[PDB]
Design an enzyme around this catalytic site. Structure first.
Site, PDB file in Angstrom:
ATOM      1  N   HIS B   5       0.791  -1.214   0.000  1.00 48.74           N
ATOM      2  CA  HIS B   5       0.000   0.000   0.000  1.00 48.74           C
ATOM      3  C   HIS B   5       0.834   1.279   0.000  1.00 48.74           C
ATOM      4  O   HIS B   5       0.454   2.263  -0.635  1.00 48.74           O
ATOM      5  CB  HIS B   5      -0.947  -0.016   1.187  1.00 48.74           C
ATOM      6  CG  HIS B   5      -2.103  -0.941   0.994  1.00 48.74           C
ATOM      7  ND1 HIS B   5      -3.143  -0.653   0.137  1.00 48.74           N
ATOM      8  CD2 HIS B   5      -2.368  -2.162   1.514  1.00 48.74           C
ATOM      9  CE1 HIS B   5      -4.004  -1.653   0.145  1.00 48.74           C
ATOM     10  NE2 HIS B   5      -3.559  -2.581   0.972  1.00 48.74           N
ATOM     11  N   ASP B  11       3.739   5.638  -5.498  1.00 49.49           N
ATOM     12  CA  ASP B  11       3.785   5.647  -6.946  1.00 49.49           C
ATOM     13  C   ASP B  11       2.986   6.845  -7.442  1.00 49.49           C
ATOM     14  O   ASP B  11       1.783   6.758  -7.674  1.00 49.49           O
ATOM     15  CB  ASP B  11       3.236   4.346  -7.505  1.00 49.49           C
ATOM     16  CG  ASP B  11       3.485   4.193  -8.969  1.00 49.49           C
ATOM     17  OD1 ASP B  11       3.719   5.205  -9.650  1.00 49.49           O
ATOM     18  OD2 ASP B  11       3.439   3.048  -9.444  1.00 49.49           O
ATOM     19  N   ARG B  14       1.107   6.492 -10.769  1.00 49.63           N
ATOM     20  CA  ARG B  14      -0.183   5.847 -10.643  1.00 49.63           C
ATOM     21  C   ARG B  14      -1.190   6.784  -9.976  1.00 49.63           C
ATOM     22  O   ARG B  14      -2.312   6.897 -10.435  1.00 49.63           O
ATOM     23  CB  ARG B  14      -0.069   4.533  -9.856  1.00 49.63           C
ATOM     24  CG  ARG B  14      -0.651   4.612  -8.456  1.00 49.63           C
ATOM     25  CD  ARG B  14      -1.158   3.303  -7.887  1.00 49.63           C
ATOM     26  NE  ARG B  14      -2.396   3.451  -7.115  1.00 49.63           N
ATOM     27  CZ  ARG B  14      -2.565   4.246  -6.060  1.00 49.63           C
ATOM     28  NH1 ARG B  14      -1.584   5.015  -5.616  1.00 49.63           N
ATOM     29  NH2 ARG B  14      -3.735   4.277  -5.444  1.00 49.63           N
ATOM     30  N   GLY B  38     -12.491  -2.487  -5.221  1.00 48.47           N
ATOM     31  CA  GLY B  38     -11.194  -2.807  -4.658  1.00 48.47           C
ATOM     32  C   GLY B  38     -10.516  -1.566  -4.141  1.00 48.47           C
ATOM     33  O   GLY B  38      -9.411  -1.234  -4.547  1.00 48.47           O
ATOM     34  N   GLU B  60     -14.134  -3.283  -0.662  1.00 44.03           N
ATOM     35  CA  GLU B  60     -12.776  -3.786  -0.461  1.00 44.03           C
ATOM     36  C   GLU B  60     -12.781  -5.114   0.258  1.00 44.03           C
ATOM     37  O   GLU B  60     -13.171  -5.192   1.417  1.00 44.03           O
ATOM     38  CB  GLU B  60     -11.930  -2.783   0.328  1.00 44.03           C
ATOM     39  CG  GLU B  60     -10.596  -3.322   0.798  1.00 44.03           C
ATOM     40  CD  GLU B  60      -9.690  -3.756  -0.332  1.00 44.03           C
ATOM     41  OE1 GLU B  60      -9.758  -3.178  -1.431  1.00 44.03           O
ATOM     42  OE2 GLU B  60      -8.900  -4.690  -0.122  1.00 44.03           O
ATOM     43  N   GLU B  89     -18.469  -9.133  -5.872  1.00 45.12           N
ATOM     44  CA  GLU B  89     -19.392 -10.088  -6.463  1.00 45.12           C
ATOM     45  C   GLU B  89     -20.645 -10.286  -5.632  1.00 45.12           C
ATOM     46  O   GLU B  89     -21.678 -10.674  -6.157  1.00 45.12           O
ATOM     47  CB  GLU B  89     -18.708 -11.437  -6.659  1.00 45.12           C
ATOM     48  CG  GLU B  89     -17.668 -11.478  -7.762  1.00 45.12           C
ATOM     49  CD  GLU B  89     -16.389 -10.758  -7.407  1.00 45.12           C
ATOM     50  OE1 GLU B  89     -16.321 -10.153  -6.320  1.00 45.12           O
ATOM     51  OE2 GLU B  89     -15.442 -10.817  -8.213  1.00 45.12           O
ATOM     52  N   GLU B 103      -8.692   0.324  -9.598  1.00 48.52           N
ATOM     53  CA  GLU B 103      -7.287   0.096  -9.888  1.00 48.52           C
ATOM     54  C   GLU B 103      -7.073  -1.399  -9.896  1.00 48.52           C
ATOM     55  O   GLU B 103      -6.692  -1.990  -8.897  1.00 48.52           O
ATOM     56  CB  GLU B 103      -6.405   0.782  -8.857  1.00 48.52           C
ATOM     57  CG  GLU B 103      -4.924   0.513  -9.001  1.00 48.52           C
ATOM     58  CD  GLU B 103      -4.160   0.948  -7.776  1.00 48.52           C
ATOM     59  OE1 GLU B 103      -4.757   1.633  -6.928  1.00 48.52           O
ATOM     60  OE2 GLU B 103      -2.971   0.606  -7.650  1.00 48.52           O
ATOM     61  N   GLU B 112      -3.054 -11.539 -11.024  1.00 48.29           N
ATOM     62  CA  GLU B 112      -3.766 -11.217  -9.796  1.00 48.29           C
ATOM     63  C   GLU B 112      -4.519  -9.934  -9.961  1.00 48.29           C
ATOM     64  O   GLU B 112      -4.556  -9.103  -9.059  1.00 48.29           O
ATOM     65  CB  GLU B 112      -2.811 -11.130  -8.612  1.00 48.29           C
ATOM     66  CG  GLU B 112      -2.487 -12.496  -8.010  1.00 48.29           C
ATOM     67  CD  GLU B 112      -1.441 -12.428  -6.927  1.00 48.29           C
ATOM     68  OE1 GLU B 112      -0.987 -11.304  -6.630  1.00 48.29           O
ATOM     69  OE2 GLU B 112      -1.068 -13.492  -6.381  1.00 48.29           O
TER      70      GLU B 112
HETATM   71  N1  LIG Z   1     -13.343  -9.103  -5.845  1.00 47.24           N
HETATM   72  C1  LIG Z   1     -12.936  -8.103  -5.077  1.00 47.24           C
HETATM   73  N2  LIG Z   1     -13.844  -7.351  -4.366  1.00 47.24           N
HETATM   74  C2  LIG Z   1     -13.415  -6.314  -3.566  1.00 47.24           C
HETATM   75  N3  LIG Z   1     -12.076  -6.031  -3.480  1.00 47.24           N
HETATM   76  C3  LIG Z   1     -11.190  -6.757  -4.183  1.00 47.24           C
HETATM   77  C4  LIG Z   1     -11.588  -7.803  -4.990  1.00 47.24           C
HETATM   78  N4  LIG Z   1     -10.490  -8.341  -5.562  1.00 47.24           N
HETATM   79  C5  LIG Z   1      -9.407  -7.656  -5.128  1.00 47.24           C
HETATM   80  N5  LIG Z   1      -9.839  -6.677  -4.273  1.00 47.24           N
HETATM   81  C6  LIG Z   1      -9.055  -5.672  -3.565  1.00 47.24           C
HETATM   82  O1  LIG Z   1      -8.760  -4.615  -4.440  1.00 47.24           O
HETATM   83  C7  LIG Z   1      -7.648  -3.923  -3.939  1.00 47.24           C
HETATM   84  C8  LIG Z   1      -6.764  -3.494  -5.103  1.00 47.24           C
HETATM   85  S1  LIG Z   1      -5.190  -2.770  -4.582  1.00 47.24           S
HETATM   86  C9  LIG Z   1      -6.062  -1.385  -3.829  1.00 47.24           C
HETATM   87  C10 LIG Z   1      -6.103  -0.192  -4.768  1.00 47.24           C
HETATM   88  C11 LIG Z   1      -6.940   0.953  -4.229  1.00 47.24           C
HETATM   89  N6  LIG Z   1      -7.525   1.693  -5.330  1.00 47.24           N
HETATM   90  C12 LIG Z   1      -6.114   1.864  -3.329  1.00 47.24           C
HETATM   91  O2  LIG Z   1      -5.747   2.962  -3.719  1.00 47.24           O
HETATM   92  O3  LIG Z   1      -5.796   1.539  -2.188  1.00 47.24           O
HETATM   93  C13 LIG Z   1      -6.953  -4.884  -2.986  1.00 47.24           C
HETATM   94  O4  LIG Z   1      -7.107  -4.395  -1.682  1.00 47.24           O
HETATM   95  C14 LIG Z   1      -7.724  -6.174  -3.065  1.00 47.24           C
HETATM   96  O5  LIG Z   1      -7.867  -6.714  -1.777  1.00 47.24           O
END
Ligand SMILES: Nc1ncnc2c1ncn2[C@@H]1O[C@H](CSCC[C@H](N)C(=O)O)[C@@H](O)[C@H]1O
Ligand SMILES: Nc1ncnc2c1ncn2[C@@H]1O[C@H](CSCC[C@H](N)C(=O)O)[C@@H](O)[C@H]1O
Lengths: 318, 318
Positions: B5, B11, B14, B38, B60, B89, B103, B112
């Site tokens: 994180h 970054d 990004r 996410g 999340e 989902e 993201e 992943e």
């Molecule tokens: N199916 C899903 N539903 C909810 N969160 C998910 C997911 N698949 C992955 N993630 C989550 O999505 C996140 C992407 S990395 C987090 C990026 C976020 N935009 C930020 O700035 O902090 C991860 O925490 C991962 O746990």
């Protein structure tokens, strides 16, 4: 597993210290026999050959022993350098040796270190009064204010002035998961991280009677120091030096005040940072131990007292 | 798991690309609703709030969702930004949304990656004609001469002129264990590593019908390029860009020719280096696939033909 070996050879501090430490004992080595304990790609055994040793037995437990034999023959020494697979504890040498050379130090000196195997080979294969390269090791500890850590931590309180989102709360979070654990962290520091004068808390003459014993009982000692000034104390840093006998002895150091080696340093983080100030007294005891899990894995027992805060204990493991 | 994180927020390529990509769609977002898929520590959901969205649902799946809610409330947005634990989902939103922000890109774009979950949320929660941030992704491949790799490899043939021990044989060894495998290597390259003009082999409009299908069938295409000059070809490098709709669109790129991101690049090493020369033709096909092991894990199928060497196939996995 190549990465470990390029990292050693690209460590010119380590490699040159050994090259020169071996060379400077040319008089002790010339026309005599050496046992190289844990020879890896074999470079040390060849240094010995180049210091005029009549015969060198390079013993290497890992698979890499085949490269060493390839390295020996390419260097024209198939006749005087003999590479022998298998642990040194059970290898069979045709004779006893005049000198042992070994690069046995691991992270924090003793993590996954071959010191025990070296002592074993000393008892079993080293002639009476025989040479040990290196001959001793000293252990050091200094309180630190990890500048990298302070950056990582304080950064969440900076997000507001970079993207306009306050993420100050993540600093608590980061602290707990970066310091609120008890692993030993291998990180390279600089002198800018050192927070009071480094204290040498232990010395091991490799040849001395009872060393295998102390290794099992725990190697360490007390220490006392005074901070250089105001900062967050993040914990302590442990490192070592090994000394080659000479003339003035050659020392290979892994101090943050000295040139970076692949060993870097072993860091002991408190559960959270502590505000200290100029001349804040810090003392304690620090002990390196086998893990009950696995004596290959380094354990470090820290008791510390910061200023007149109560003395605390923290038990680390690699 | 903090390291992942801080690495994202540090970054700035990004973070700023998203901040600005979101801001520039202020007109599409103002007074409307967003689903952040996410949300992590939540910074994107707050960008949306700052772009005037009436309501943002930050979903999340990991434990970090608690920081996000803490981040939201600290930023005074407990009223418009709602943090919801659990996979997207099966989360339950009170309404359908006007826009999805996410993201979702992983290493090599799809390792992943949350792309499937994004498409799912698009189908289930995104209103008809709704916005997707980012909206598309393009995939690129270039042949490389990895300068770091050439250094690591050729270095064993340098040991002689640095310590006087020939270790040339270790270069064969290093090659086999550094290139004679089929893992995908995540490494940051520079333009100095790029060996022919980068070729874009795929484009994904996120909103397009049939995308989940192609993701399972394999995403990729053919490519053809001509080397800039004489060097050892070490293999290929894959990266991506994502595009935010605008006006001229905002592009976030992970190309080695562009500023470094935490994504770096995904490298595909041949089993050994290949001498190429100016205008050596290289073509092939490259396909990104789910692993049968685990669709979360990126598989990449490479078929390549170097000059008029026979065409070869190499099947990589993360
Ligand atoms: N199916 C899903 N539903 C909810 N969160 C998910 C997911 N698949 C992955 N993630 C989550 O999505 C996140 C992407 S990395 C987090 C990026 C976020 N935009 C930020 O700035 O902090 C991860 O925490 C991962 O746990
Ligand atoms: N008990 C043992 N007997 C023989 N080799 C051992 C051993 N314990 C550890 N080793 C080996 O000792 C090596 C130490 S690292 C190798 C250093 C070597 N001097 C070089 O320059 O390459 C490792 O290869 C490890 O496999």
């Amino acid at each position: 597993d190549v990465s470990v070996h390029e990292e050693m050879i690209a460590d010119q501090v380590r490699t040159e210290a050994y090259r020169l430490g071996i060379l400077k004992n040319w008089a002790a080595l010339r026309g005599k026999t050496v046992l190289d304990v844990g020879a890896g790609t074999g470079i040390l055994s060849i240094f010995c050959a180049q210091a005029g040793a009549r015969r060198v037995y390079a013993v290497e437990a890992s698979a890499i022993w085949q490269q060493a034999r390839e390295v020996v023959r390419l260097n024209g020494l198939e006749d005087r350098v003999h590479v022998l697979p298998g642990p040194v504890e059970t290898v069979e040498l045709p004779e006893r040796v005049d000198a042992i050379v070994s690069e046995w130090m691991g992270y924090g000196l003793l993590h996954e270190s071959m010191l025990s195997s070296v002592l074993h080979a000393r008892t079993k294969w080293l002639k009476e009064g025989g040479l040990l390269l290196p001959a001793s090791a000293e252990l050091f500890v200094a309180p630190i204010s990890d500048q990298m850590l302070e950056w990582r931590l304080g950064f969440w309180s900076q997000v507001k002035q970079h993207y306009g989102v306050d993420m100050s709360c993540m600093e608590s979070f980061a602290t707990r998961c970066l310091m609120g654990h008890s692993e030993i962290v291998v990180q390279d520091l600089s002198g800018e991280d050192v927070l009071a004068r480094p204290q040498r808390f232990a010395q091991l003459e490799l040849a001395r009677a009872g060393l295998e014993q102390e290794l099992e009982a725990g190697v360490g000692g007390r220490f006392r120091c005074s901070c250089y000034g105001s900062a967050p104390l993040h914990g302590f840093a442990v490192w070592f030096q090994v000394t080659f006998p000479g003339e003035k002895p050659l020392v290979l150091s892994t101090s943050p005040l000295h040139p970076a080696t692949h060993w870097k340093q072993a860091l002991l983080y408190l559960n959270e940072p502590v505000p200290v100030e100029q001349d804040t007294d810090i003392s304690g005891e620090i002990t390196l131990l086998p893990s009950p899990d696995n004596p290959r894995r380094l354990r470090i027992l820290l008791r510390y007292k910061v200023g007149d805060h109560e003395e605390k204990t923290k038990d680390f493991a690699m």
